[PDB]
């Protein structure tokens, strides 16, 4: 269920226009973020109790705000 949550959350920050490619996964990103957070806190207490990597914080915390602000994240990536 950890990997299921992460694959529910990946096409929101990877899609080049996520409001017109996956709105169903976008509209409930907050619930999947909180579910991922409590599954890190409870079932994986031995690693993420008192420390968490930066990209996990960026992924769980901010990206509904960024996708409201700009519109996409994978369009504004750096792979080019």
């Amino acid at each position: 269920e950890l990997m299921d949550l992460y694959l529910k959350m990946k096409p929101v920050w990877r899609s080049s226009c996520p409001a017109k490619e996956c709105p169903e996964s976008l509209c409930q990103y907050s619930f999947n973020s909180q579910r991922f957070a409590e599954l890190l806190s409870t079932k994986f207490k031995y690693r993420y109790e008192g420390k968490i990597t930066n990209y996990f914080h960026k992924t769980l915390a901010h990206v509904p705000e960024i996708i409201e602000r700009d519109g996409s994240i994978g369009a504004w990536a750096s792979e080019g």
Binding site: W13, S33, E49, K51, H57, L60, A61, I73, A77, E79
Partner: protein, 320 residues
């Protein structure tokens, strides 16, 4: 190409390909420094010469024996000249885009471009033999793309051109190539500050460009999204990668982000980092160093590139 052209002309008798002096003469139409363009108002600290191409990215940095030893090679385009060239070769795309949206072709409305900027250094580019300075074996490239072009028709905003495959290698247009190290701060700031000066000037003016028989009017919006986390922390003036303050968009700390984990808001900016570095170096409250850093939230250096609060997605994938 010379081999292919020479033996095709030798076999068929005809001249199917052009000789490469004709390629060279037809090449200069698209290189920077060809077209007329007028800024309105004129740009501060920018000459109005319209024939400036590949220039030394040192911008006349003093290489004498008496002062700071520079050891980098750089070549760059002037920023406005490159934006004119990149707007002029995709003229046909802009015309077809406004044609497909039921607009005219003689329209000269104020276009709002949005230009996505990106910089990343590289490693293990080998230094050559021969004469020149003691160049490090790293390169740094600064480049931009043109994401969208939006013209205002009627009351609302319509878009004309959209980059269809935005992460291509066909649309990351190069702007400056230097043989520096992005770990080094002095040579990086020295090479890179002319482009930031040009960009800061161009943020507040208009460009007039003759596009298919009609003079039209452009204005730009620059977004620096294409930097990784290390370069954002090293340029925007925050602490390094292993600090107790983690997010480059908010003021949270590592333990209190391990506790809450969801509920934040984007807080950092560029002007806020300017006010914070002035708070750090002015020290208005006579506080000691630890409570100073706690007041200023880890800002302890002068930022020198405005980078927007966003997330690189490629390194986000690799980190997860």
């Amino acid at each position: 190409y010379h081999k292919m052209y020479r033996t095709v002309k030798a076999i068929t008798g005809r001249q199917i390909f052009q000789p490469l002096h004709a390629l060279r003469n037809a090449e200069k139409v698209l290189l920077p420094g060809y077209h007329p363009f007028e800024w309105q108002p004129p740009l501060k600290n920018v000459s109005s010469r319209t024939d400036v191409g590949i220039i030394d990215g040192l911008s006349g940095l003093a290489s004498s024996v008496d002062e700071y030893p520079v050891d980098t090679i750089a070549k760059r385009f002037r920023y406005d000249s490159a934006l004119v060239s990149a707007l002029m070769d995709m003229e046909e795309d802009i015309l077809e885009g406004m044609r497909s949206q039921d607009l005219d072709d003689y329209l000269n409305g104020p276009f709002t471009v949005v230009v996505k900027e990106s910089c990343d250094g590289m490693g293990d580019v080998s230094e050559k033999h021969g004469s020149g300075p003691a160049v490090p074996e790293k390169a740094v490239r600064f480049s931009f793309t043109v994401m969208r072009i939006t013209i205002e028709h009627g009351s609302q905003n319509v878009k004309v051109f959209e980059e269809p495959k935005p992460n291509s290698e066909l649309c990351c247009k190069p702007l400056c190539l230097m043989l520096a190290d992005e770990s080094d701060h002095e040579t990086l700031t020295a090479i890179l500050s002319p482009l930031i000066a040009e960009r800061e000037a161009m943020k507040s003016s208009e460009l007039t460009l003759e596009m298919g028989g009609i003079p039209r009017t452009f204005k730009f919006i620059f977004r620096g999204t294409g930097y990784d986390e290390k370069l954002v922390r090293e340029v925007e003036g925050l602490e390094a990668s292993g600090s107790v303050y983690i997010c480059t968009l908010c003021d949270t700390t590592r333990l209190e982000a391990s506790q809450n984990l969801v509920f934040h808001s984007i807080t950092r900016s560029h002007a806020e980092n300017l006010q914070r570095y002035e708070v750090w170096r002015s020290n208005p409250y006579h506080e000691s160093v630890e409570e100073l850093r706690d007041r200023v939230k880890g800002v302890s250096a002068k930022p020198f590139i405005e980078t927007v609060p966003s997330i690189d997605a490629l390194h986000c994938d690799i980190g997860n």
